[PDB]
Amino acid sequence: GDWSALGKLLDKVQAYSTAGGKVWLSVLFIFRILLLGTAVESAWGDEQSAFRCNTQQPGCENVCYDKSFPISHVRFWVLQIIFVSVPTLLYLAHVFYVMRKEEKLNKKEERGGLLRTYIISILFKSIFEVAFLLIQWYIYGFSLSAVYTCKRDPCPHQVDCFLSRPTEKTIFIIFMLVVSLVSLALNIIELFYVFFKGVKD
Amino acid sequence: GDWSALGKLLDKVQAYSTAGGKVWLSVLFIFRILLLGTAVESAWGDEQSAFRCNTQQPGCENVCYDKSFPISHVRFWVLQIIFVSVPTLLYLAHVFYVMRKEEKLNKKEERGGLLRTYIISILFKSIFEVAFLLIQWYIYGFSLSAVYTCKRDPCPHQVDCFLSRPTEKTIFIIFMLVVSLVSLALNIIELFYVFFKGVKD
Amino acid sequence: GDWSALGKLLDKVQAYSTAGGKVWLSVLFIFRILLLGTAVESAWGDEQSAFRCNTQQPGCENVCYDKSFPISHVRFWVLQIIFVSVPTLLYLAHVFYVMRKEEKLNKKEERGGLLRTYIISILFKSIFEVAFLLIQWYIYGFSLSAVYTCKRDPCPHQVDCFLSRPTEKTIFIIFMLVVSLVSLALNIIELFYVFFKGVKD
Amino acid sequence: GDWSALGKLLDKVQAYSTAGGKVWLSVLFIFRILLLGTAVESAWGDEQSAFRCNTQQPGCENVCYDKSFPISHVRFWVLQIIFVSVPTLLYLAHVFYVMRKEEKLNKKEERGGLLRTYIISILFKSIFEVAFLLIQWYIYGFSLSAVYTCKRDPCPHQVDCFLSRPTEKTIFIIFMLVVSLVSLALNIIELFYVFFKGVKD
Amino acid sequence: GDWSALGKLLDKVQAYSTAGGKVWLSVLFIFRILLLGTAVESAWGDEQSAFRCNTQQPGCENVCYDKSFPISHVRFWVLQIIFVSVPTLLYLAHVFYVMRKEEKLNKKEERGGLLRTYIISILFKSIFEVAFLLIQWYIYGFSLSAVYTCKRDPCPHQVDCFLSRPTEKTIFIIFMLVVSLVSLALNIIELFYVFFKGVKD
Amino acid sequence: GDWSALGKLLDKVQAYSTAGGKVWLSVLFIFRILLLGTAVESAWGDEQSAFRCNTQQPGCENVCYDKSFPISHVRFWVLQIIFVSVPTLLYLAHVFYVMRKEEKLNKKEERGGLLRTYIISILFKSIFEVAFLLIQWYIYGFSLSAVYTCKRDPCPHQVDCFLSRPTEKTIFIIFMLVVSLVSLALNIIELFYVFFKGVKD
Ligand SMILES: CC(C)CCC[C@@H](C)[C@H]1CC[C@H]2[C@@H]3CC=C4C[C@@H](OC(=O)CCC(=O)O)CC[C@]4(C)[C@H]3CC[C@]12C
Ligand SMILES: CC(C)CCC[C@@H](C)[C@H]1CC[C@H]2[C@@H]3CC=C4C[C@@H](OC(=O)CCC(=O)O)CC[C@]4(C)[C@H]3CC[C@]12C
Ligand SMILES: CC(C)CCC[C@@H](C)[C@H]1CC[C@H]2[C@@H]3CC=C4C[C@@H](OC(=O)CCC(=O)O)CC[C@]4(C)[C@H]3CC[C@]12C
Ligand SMILES: CC(C)CCC[C@@H](C)[C@H]1CC[C@H]2[C@@H]3CC=C4C[C@@H](OC(=O)CCC(=O)O)CC[C@]4(C)[C@H]3CC[C@]12C
Ligand SMILES: CC(C)CCC[C@@H](C)[C@H]1CC[C@H]2[C@@H]3CC=C4C[C@@H](OC(=O)CCC(=O)O)CC[C@]4(C)[C@H]3CC[C@]12C
Ligand SMILES: CCCCCCCCCCCCCC
Ligand SMILES: CCCCCCCCCCCCCC
Ligand SMILES: CCCCCCCCCCCCCC
Ligand SMILES: CCCCCCCCCCCCCC
Ligand SMILES: CCCCCCCCCCCCCC
Ligand SMILES: CCCCCCCCCCCCCC
């Protein structure tokens, strides 16, 4: 039995968090990863192979697909989740090393230090979430249409192209938007709780 | 040997459940996941590649497939199982944190609190199951036909399209319906048992 | 070292079984799963992609393949093995919970109960095996021919279609039949042994 | 530290084996599995997709491929290795249960039994190896030619077909033959050793 | 519980490193591997299958693709990360063996040795990073264009070819460049810290 | 904590090896396996599917590809590494069994034996490496050209065929050659060290 120090680490990491935030946020993270890995990823498999355009011009399909989709939704979401997750990993590593140093100090010699970093990490999580949402809104919006109009060389004049599985992708896009909004709300709630408990001194 | 606290956690989680519900429900969950992962998923692999329509119009197959299948059955079932499973995970996390707090209290100082949450979780499981069943009934029904009639642009007039493996998919749809009904019945039985043991005080 | 309770569980599960049945049945289960997972599954990979028919009618291949194979052999066998395996898992869970309850009783306070369930589980294993064998015999038989005659709309008149790897699939079908028969015989032997030891009182 | 009983089990399993047989046979088994899993399996991937025949007759390629290859070499070898391996697993299970029973006896109450089964297992290993070698020799031989002549309906007269990667497959076939011969020789040596140590009493 | 010597090893490995370098560099390594494995690798899947050229000359596409891409970006990055990682593994092995030898010495008999190797390893990490960046700049630059002009035999005169997913690949190239620059900066900072603490004696 | 006997085994295995050989050779093995598994294997995926020839003769591509590549480079390298690795596994097994026997002897009864086998194993490692290098030099050389000339039936006269990714494969071939040479040099150094320490007695 060697799982005790893990309990101590967990307790020290979540010193300033609310009772409900732990459960809700962790389960949301698990839900996010499972949804992205099982169902979402497979629906984008034939994103380019099933993409078709009405033309005989060689090379037009390539450029029209590139123009329609500068970056895939799934890879964008992977980047988003990695960026939202990195700060917590940094905080965990910092806490681990601090605990080791404190053990050294208090063995050989028989607020603000960690609160500030925690606040910064939460702020950066929220900032990254908002930035990714804004970028997605600017680039794509939150829906996909069946027919796309392409006006890029070497295609002559304008051509019509047809997407793959637009409705299913729209449904999943809405799901991901809802998940992101919930996560942002929870993080904002945590920030307000910490600041409102700090005011009373 | 460090598996004792796991036994305590398991005992405290299942305080209010019946003797048979544990076994039947857990085995049903295992059966559900195995069936979805091994046999069901592979049968839908060529759902769009083997989909064909009788026409020379470019883009008609894409739109007709999109209209026929707004969302795949397998991904719908994955969403259903995740939604049905989340509440139990939330309850487990809550119980774990409560047990840690109680250990702190009863070490340093040498009904209704948890019953309500358990009842709420069971109710939400049943609610999600019923909602998913109703949505599936409204959208698809519980069978698939070999020939589909498509009347969507840019297809001219109406066209005929042909599905892949309709009979096998019908069989698996019936299987999944039966499994869902059994799960709903077991949850309702658990609710009735708890309420009937609460009446006698 | 924390593997003792596992030994106790194993001993209590196999109280009423014969000496040889354990080894033979467990090794048969391992053989079944390995054979199904390694060699059998790969041979059915191109079951529909390599299926061909002599015709120019669009949609005829889809319907003819659907008629020829209402359900794939591999998925049928997966269903069979899952159904044959579930009762033992149920019995194991029941025994585990009973043992925990008995430990509680005999710690705090310092035939027929389990025999009946064991008999029922063995009976249901045999029943499922026989039912699956009968269904397979009725639907397919125990061989596959190279040429198939199709008389389904929209195909005009009758058409000829050609299967993929008929001889190899026939060989594997015979193998699976032999395995199923051996398993059924072993289960029947166990039933006879228990009933013949119960007669002498 | 709970690895002691494993050492006892290993010692009791290999009571009657020679000093060198252990190492050589175990390393040969590891070599066999690695070779089959890493290099051999990938070389047969496009066995049917790259198979081609000179004809316009629909369905001729299917039947000609089926006639040329009643069963794939890789799946045949998988069956061979499973059959050669099962007896040792049976013997291990028997020894495990016997050891548990003996522990019970010698705790509560503070040659020929196992030798015969070991001899039978070794004999069956050798028998299966020889049978598989004979079957392979009768069906295929130990080489593959680039051009195959097909005289099966519905192909008219005779047609020429061309295999994929014949030389590489020939090389691997020779490798597998050598491995099988070495294994058979080692098993025969073990049999002779046991019988020659039994003669002196 | 047998995780203590691992703690000692970790402490002795990071004797001369700064407090922040540990966390930042380790998290950067994890980020690098995750990004390369999840999102980046899949975007290059159809790098050659979707590559197209405007010509009827057989063999022109092969040679034009070979000329355009002497080596794939993903495999280049895999080589880069392996080369950047090997020195730390060498240092860890050296430290492990030195610790074992010191344990022998100090049990049986009841700066510069390791600092130099650490400095050399850090220097080589930075050197490899810079070399790979320079090679990539010389060969490809840091962007990809949609249209490529090919003037290689047997293609007649010059031909136009079209890439797959140029914009997404450009985005990921920029990401990887930023990551490499950050890693180089951190290593240089570590070198300066060690040399500036060595000056004061 | 049960990792002590592993330390003893490691110490006894490396009794006669030099201080640096351990680290360098082990890291080289890890580098070899990682390089072969991650980057090299994927570059040969479309070795036959992207192989093309200028002709209308059916069957010519098959025979020309077979003649050009009697065996794939990746599978050749897998065979090489397995052959180079087997002797060390044999030596480890022998040492393990010898240690068990010595424990028996020295518990119940409260150079040349192993040196010779170690020398033989090292010699065989070097021999296999040299043999594989010579075979590769004789068959292929150490580069690949873009255009191949084929003069095999049923192709008429001579035909031109075009390879896939020749430059990248050439680069990786050079890398593997360098790795093999380094490994051979290290093994020769170990042999010279042991023989030069044996001369002084
Ligand atoms: C082993 C390596 C290569 C990958 C797996 C390690 C990390 C990437 C994992 C381990 C624990 C995970 C965390 C577990 C749960 C949370 C929930 C959530 O964070 C919080 O709940 C913070 C507030 C709180 O916990 O009280 C956001 C994701 C996060 C940080 C996870 C992010 C990813 C983490 C750091
Ligand atoms: C490790 C993480 C990333 C994924 C795996 C963890 C959970 C998703 C698993 C662990 C235990 C599972 C549960 C085990 C068994 C049950 C049976 C069933 O629930 C009940 O039986 C509730 C009533 C009772 O147990 O008495 C419904 C599924 C559920 C909750 C499972 C849902 C999924 C759970 C929570
Ligand atoms: C971890 C979960 C998600 C999947 C793996 C757990 C079960 C599906 C496994 C564990 C042990 C297995 C059993 C091990 C061996 C047997 C042999 C055989 O049953 C018997 O031999 C019963 C009679 C006897 O054992 O004496 C039939 C399969 C069965 C029950 C297996 C069925 C599948 C079981 C229950
Ligand atoms: C099990 C084998 C087959 C593969 C996995 C083992 C190694 C390849 C791993 C184990 C730990 C890893 C290291 C963990 C973290 C670091 C962070 C970073 O190095 C440092 O931070 C050095 C400075 C410091 O740690 O203070 C660069 C990658 C590196 C060395 C990693 C490189 C890859 C390592 C050596
Ligand atoms: C678990 C099984 C199925 C596969 C994995 C086990 C073996 C194939 C591994 C375990 C340790 C490995 C060895 C670890 C390191 C070395 C380095 C190198 O050998 C030496 O360094 C010998 C000289 C020395 O170590 O001092 C060549 C590869 C070799 C023997 C490896 C070959 C493959 C080995 C034997
Ligand atoms: C008993 C719990 C079962 C969990 C099922 C997990 C399925 C595997 C999904 C792996 C891909 C998603 C994570 C990247
Ligand atoms: C001994 C028990 C064997 C269990 C077989 C499991 C097969 C692997 C299936 C993995 C996919 C389904 C879960 C997502
Ligand atoms: C040392 C034993 C090796 C076992 C080989 C297992 C091969 C992996 C097969 C996985 C698929 C079959 C189970 C679903
Ligand atoms: C350190 C040892 C590495 C072992 C490499 C194993 C490669 C994985 C091969 C898995 C397929 C073959 C077994 C079925
Ligand atoms: C709970 C943490 C989940 C981690 C997700 C990892 C996904 C698997 C990615 C594997 C490929 C990248 C490493 C090579
Ligand atoms: C933390 C270390 C990560 C190691 C990455 C390994 C990637 C998986 C590669 C597996 C194929 C190569 C071995 C056969």
Numbering used by the authors:
A (entry chain A), B (entry chain F), C (entry chain E), D (entry chain D), E (entry chain B), F (entry chain C): 2 to 111, 148 to 238
What is the paper's account of this structure, in its own sentences?
Gap junction intercellular channels (GJIChs) facilitate direct communication between adjacent cells and play important roles in various biological processes such as cardiac contraction, electrical coupling, cell differentiation, and death. GJIChs are formed when two opposing hemichannels (also called connexons) from adjacent cells are docked, each being composed of six connexin (Cx) protomers. We identify three different N-terminal helix conformations of Cx43—gate-covering (GCN), pore-lining (PLN), and flexible intermediate (FIN)—that are randomly distributed in purified GJICh particles.
Because the full GCN Cx43 GJICh structure in lipid nanodiscs that mainly contain POPE and CHS (condition 7) was assessed at a high resolution of 2.4 Å, we could clearly identify POPE and CHS molecules and understand their detailed interactions with the channel. CHS1 was located in a deep hydrophobic pocket formed between NTH, TM1, and TM2. While the sterol ring of CHS1 interacted closely with L26, F30, T89, and L93, its hydrocarbon tail interacted with L90. The lipid tails closely interacted with W4, L7, L11, and F97 of Cx43 within 5 Å and with CHS2, completely obstructing the hole. In the lipid head, the phosphate group formed a salt bridge with R101 and interacted with S5.
